[PDB]
Amino acid sequence: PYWLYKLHGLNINYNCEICGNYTYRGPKAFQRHFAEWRHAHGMRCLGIPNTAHFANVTQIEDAVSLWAKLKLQKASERWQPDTEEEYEDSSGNVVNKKTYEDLKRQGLL
Amino acid sequence: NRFTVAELKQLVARPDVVEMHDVTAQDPKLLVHLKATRNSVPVPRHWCFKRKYLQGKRGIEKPPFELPDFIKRDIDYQKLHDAFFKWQTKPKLTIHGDLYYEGKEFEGDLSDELRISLGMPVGPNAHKVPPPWLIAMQRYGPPPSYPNLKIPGLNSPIPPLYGDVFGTNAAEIDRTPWGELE
Amino acid sequence: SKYIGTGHADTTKWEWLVNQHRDSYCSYMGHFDLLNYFAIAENESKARVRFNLMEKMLQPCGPPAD
Amino acid sequence: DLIFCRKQAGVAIGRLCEKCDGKCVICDSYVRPCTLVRICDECNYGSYQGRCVICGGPGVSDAYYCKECTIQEKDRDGCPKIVNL
Amino acid sequence: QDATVYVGGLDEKVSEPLLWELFLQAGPVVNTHMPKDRVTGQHQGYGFVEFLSEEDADYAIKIMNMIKLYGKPIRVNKANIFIGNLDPEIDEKLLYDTFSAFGVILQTPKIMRDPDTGNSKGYAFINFASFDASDAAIEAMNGQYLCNRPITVSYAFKKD
Amino acid sequence: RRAGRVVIIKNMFHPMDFEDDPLVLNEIREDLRVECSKFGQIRKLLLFDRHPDGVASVSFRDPEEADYCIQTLDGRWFGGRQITAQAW
Amino acid sequence: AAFSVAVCRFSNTGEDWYVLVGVAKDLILNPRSVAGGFVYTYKLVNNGEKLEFLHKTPVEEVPAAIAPFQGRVLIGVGKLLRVYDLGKKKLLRKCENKHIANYISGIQTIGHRVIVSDVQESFIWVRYKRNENQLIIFADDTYPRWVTTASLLDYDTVAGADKFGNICVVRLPPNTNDEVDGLLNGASQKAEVIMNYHVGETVLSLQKTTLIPGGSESLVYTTLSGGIGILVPFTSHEDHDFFQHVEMHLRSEHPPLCGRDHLSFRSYYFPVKNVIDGDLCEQFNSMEPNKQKNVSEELDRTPPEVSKKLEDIRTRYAF
Amino acid sequence: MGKDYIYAVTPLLEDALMDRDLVHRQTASAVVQHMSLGVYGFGCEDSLNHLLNYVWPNVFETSPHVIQAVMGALEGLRVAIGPCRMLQYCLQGLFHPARKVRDVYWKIYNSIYIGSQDALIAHYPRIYNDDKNTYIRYELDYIL
RNA sequence: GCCGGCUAAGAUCAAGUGUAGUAUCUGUUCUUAUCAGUUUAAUAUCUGAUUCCUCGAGGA
Ligand SMILES: [Zn+2]
Ligand SMILES: [Zn+2]
Ligand SMILES: [Zn+2]
Ligand SMILES: [Zn+2]
């Protein structure tokens, strides 16, 4: 059925560095490989989880840069009470509202 | 003079909506932005397929039509009309964005039948009739996965137990709706 | 195609956006209580807000590309 | 070549023949006629004065839009006379 | 496999939501799986319950062990003589201790397991020291009342 | 609904050839009938011997056979002249 | 420029009252630009007759909504929702959510939950976790709404208004789980729209109240053109059916004067849902006797009975 | 009169819309259109949105009768369900990379735009300014 | 459909039959190959160029 060979997408091969330069076949299989076991294994090597964000990304440095970006974004948009909080310790009790959540424990210890 | 997938993923606020062909659009930045609107269900997903929207597999051979329960329970007078409008229930409905596609059709308390088949008697008035899994809980201790569960004999009193209820979860306002018919 | 504001497979972002800006300004001119809202918000007479919208009608979203 | 006229409609009333009497001009329905049909001045002139808007035979009664076409404001386009080229 | 518990000894009254409802008191059972047969199209008595934590699976294995569910010896576990229709609640050491009363065992016995689940298939093979222990197992143990399961001991190979 | 079968052949013959040959017109009509019978059931076939462009009409029972005859007759040569075929 | 005001008491203080005023600093409207914002605090002494300045807390955006909440205060600082406690020199930030869409225009609280109004999105439901110190979004809507004002009807339902002249009622499904720790690029659970009505004028005030002594509760709204109106619930199916038939028959035999379709006008931006236009229904009393008889004889009734039935529901709630 | 009977025929229309036969889907679309235009102002939007979820995948159909019935059903749902939902269904396809998707979606969008051009003013999504052009509508951001 | 595959997964070019319309059947072929241009969301398509081995023959 040499006709299906070129109708279904074969004879067109794609490669991914995150996957041992493993060269994949026609696009229907290539798009599915990011969810398969081998790509998850390759991604664990860098320490980056497999999510929908890291799809159609085949190069290593692109993955690490996009991981830095996503890390910065998410870490920014959370609520971190340790550094984000306004305590006013009872040392003067009418001043010094610039105390963080850690300096207050040091002053109350 | 066209973006790559990883390059466009770096520019957009939401990279997980970017796809293979999205870099081949005439204006990919507007396309990805509209793909991220807080609504707007996506495209039917079979535009790129080559099987004319009807998959010839999955064993579609099945029963023709299952009528609702209200269907079964002159032909019927206004009393059976009363029955058809007392039994009428709302069916299962999908919300605004749940499009259909070829594949998505297939993918402390015990029942009386299981208690009758397991050989466990009914609950007495004032006695101790525990299940055989309760002796291990009385010997080893309460389960750490459900600390709020109560069992008769250990945490719940014997007179509790009523029918097939051999356990109760005890977790440690003005809820009336405003305008409703009387 | 004969109706103004319709699109097609070659419509650009600029044409779409100027079309919706233009019929937004016309809808503001039409509805009596939207113009009231704007004239109270920016502290102007309603005739002045109407004239400003008509003047903005000519080139909304700036001049086109290239 | 079944194309509507779609010109500015005037004060002339559309007419239907004995064969098309109950029909709606736009969707060909027979249920609930709702709105009286108006035609332009070039469709109502001289020999064209009284004629079926669907076929063009001698008119006998008024043409109407159906309630379904009236709800969708399809009576707001131009002259609905079927014209052949 | 660690968070999931393999249950063995399920009758026809037990079902896929019934095991999740019975295991809900032990822990948060997230999913239940029942492999269907190819000839009959029903469950073969062995299934799996995947919970959220491993402590809930350990409590379900320590609580629902050797229970009488639907008239069947249901038991949860961490996912030349032939003995058939044996209970899955017994282990290799338990079978070696039960076989030590009749005769002396040559080595540790082995029990067959399914290639999908791997908890219990239904048959086991045990070897005795001499033929007298095999004759005592075929006379006494072949038909003895085990833990809610009638076992059957037979000879694996015999020459006429 | 939907839309709700005659092929016209031109540049096939001339009236000047039938003035000195009374048997050429009947032979051309028989050749046109034998050509139209291979595409489908011909219900009516006429040839205008007084037309200067050589007009001929072939009416069949089905419009698909007339379309196939118009596709097979367009650009073909008949008697040394390029004849054209169109629908009706 | 002041945009929000609140009077409340703080738990860490005694029974003293305070006034909080939110102020924008160097606001431009078109194109929009602002330099910052401030929150003023006053002590409201002398039996509620005098304000005395206490301090002035800077914020990086226009504080548009201030609401007392459980002995503290919630403040919408542009896109941000914050909890604030009273301090000796300023207000102390305690909690914060950063996932509200565009701009907070209103905040309302019933004892457990917080309702947020977005300038372009309709409504966000939030829960405050008292022991974890967390503000979590657990529900939102599926429509864009330019909310002008909002009113709580009960623990699950909210009445909203719009810049374009619409009123809507939104209710949480009974499935709704409050204890949370997107499916449409939004929240996981959605809210259902149970009412839609076009008024024709921009509503800026909504309030549930009883107008006459010994009457029933109604929803009173207020409009930018100087109009006042109410929406009242039906208590039986018979009254609802009768008024529905009156509206149906009056839509045809007494059409609007300037050529508008009545059902199409009340469906200007969204289709009508569960509202009967009583301003069309009371036009029955001003028709001619022949058409009054033609209308009344279809409802199996006389014109005086229809008039009495129309007056009954009005005098039950309003004047 | 059909407002009391939409819940009873919904599973049958589901079944007919999942069918491979073309006449099945064409006639189910016709039913959806007549049902939509029949109930309007009576609060039956739940079942109609549910049925739109099954009608919409047929927009990529080449058969003329099926696509005609689908367009009729879409224009009936534009009245019964509202233009906001239709714009929400069209937004992601208006600027798709494939020309087929763009053609279909712009046809549907033009049909939605010619009827109820005024309502769409309140439904358009926010589009941010770029370096060259201003796209935010600032008047609607005013807060009295 | 059966336990990744057995070439019923697609396109195409000629002819026949037939309808108001959709269509139905036969021969086929399917580049097993490379580069450049057109084009397609990507394929596709189209437009051009490109001595050896075996037993007089065949294949590359
Ligand atoms: Zn890879
Ligand atoms: Zn009509
Ligand atoms: Zn006629
Ligand atoms: Zn005309």
Side-chain angles (χ1 to χ4, degrees), chain A residues 16 18-19 24 33-34 39:
Chain A
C16 182
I18 297 154
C19 263
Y24 296 86
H33 92 247
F34 296 94
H39 199 75

CSV table of all heavy atoms in Angstrom, one decimal, chain A residues 16 18-19 24 33-34 39, ligand 1:
chain,number,residue,atom,x,y,z
A,16,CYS,N,14.1,14.5,17.9
A,16,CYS,CA,14.0,15.2,19.2
A,16,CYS,C,15.3,14.9,20.0
A,16,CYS,O,15.6,13.8,20.3
A,16,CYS,CB,12.8,14.8,20.0
A,16,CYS,SG,12.6,15.7,21.5
A,18,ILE,N,15.7,15.9,23.1
A,18,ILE,CA,15.3,15.5,24.5
A,18,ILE,C,15.1,14.0,24.5
A,18,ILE,O,15.3,13.3,25.6
A,18,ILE,CB,14.0,16.2,24.9
A,18,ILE,CG1,14.3,17.7,25.0
A,18,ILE,CG2,13.5,15.7,26.2
A,18,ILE,CD1,13.0,18.6,24.8
A,19,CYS,N,14.9,13.4,23.3
A,19,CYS,CA,14.8,11.9,23.2
A,19,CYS,C,15.9,11.4,22.4
A,19,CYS,O,15.8,11.2,21.2
A,19,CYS,CB,13.4,11.5,22.6
A,19,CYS,SG,12.1,11.1,23.7
A,24,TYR,N,11.6,10.2,14.9
A,24,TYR,CA,10.3,9.7,14.8
A,24,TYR,C,9.7,9.9,13.4
A,24,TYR,O,10.2,10.7,12.6
A,24,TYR,CB,9.3,10.4,15.8
A,24,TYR,CG,9.7,10.1,17.3
A,24,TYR,CD1,10.6,11.0,17.9
A,24,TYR,CD2,9.1,9.1,18.0
A,24,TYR,CE1,10.9,10.7,19.2
A,24,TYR,CE2,9.4,8.9,19.3
A,24,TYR,CZ,10.3,9.7,19.9
A,24,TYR,OH,10.7,9.5,21.2
A,33,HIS,N,4.4,11.4,20.7
A,33,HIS,CA,5.6,10.8,21.4
A,33,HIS,C,5.8,11.6,22.7
A,33,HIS,O,6.4,11.1,23.7
A,33,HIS,CB,6.8,10.8,20.5
A,33,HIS,CG,7.6,12.0,20.6
A,33,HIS,ND1,7.7,12.9,19.5
A,33,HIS,CD2,8.5,12.5,21.6
A,33,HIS,CE1,8.6,13.9,19.9
A,33,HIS,NE2,9.0,13.7,21.1
A,34,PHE,N,5.4,12.9,22.8
A,34,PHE,CA,5.7,13.7,23.9
A,34,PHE,C,5.0,13.1,25.2
A,34,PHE,O,5.4,13.4,26.3
A,34,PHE,CB,5.3,15.1,23.7
A,34,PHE,CG,6.0,15.8,22.6
A,34,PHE,CD1,5.6,15.8,21.3
A,34,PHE,CD2,7.3,16.4,22.9
A,34,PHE,CE1,6.3,16.4,20.3
A,34,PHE,CE2,8.0,17.1,21.9
A,34,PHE,CZ,7.5,17.1,20.6
A,39,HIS,N,9.8,10.0,26.2
A,39,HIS,CA,10.0,11.4,26.3
A,39,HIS,C,9.9,11.8,27.7
A,39,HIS,O,10.6,12.7,28.1
A,39,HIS,CB,8.9,12.1,25.4
A,39,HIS,CG,9.3,13.6,25.2
A,39,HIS,ND1,10.2,13.9,24.2
A,39,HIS,CD2,8.8,14.7,25.7
A,39,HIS,CE1,10.3,15.2,24.2
A,39,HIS,NE2,9.5,15.7,25.1
J,1,ZN,ZN,11.0,13.8,22.1
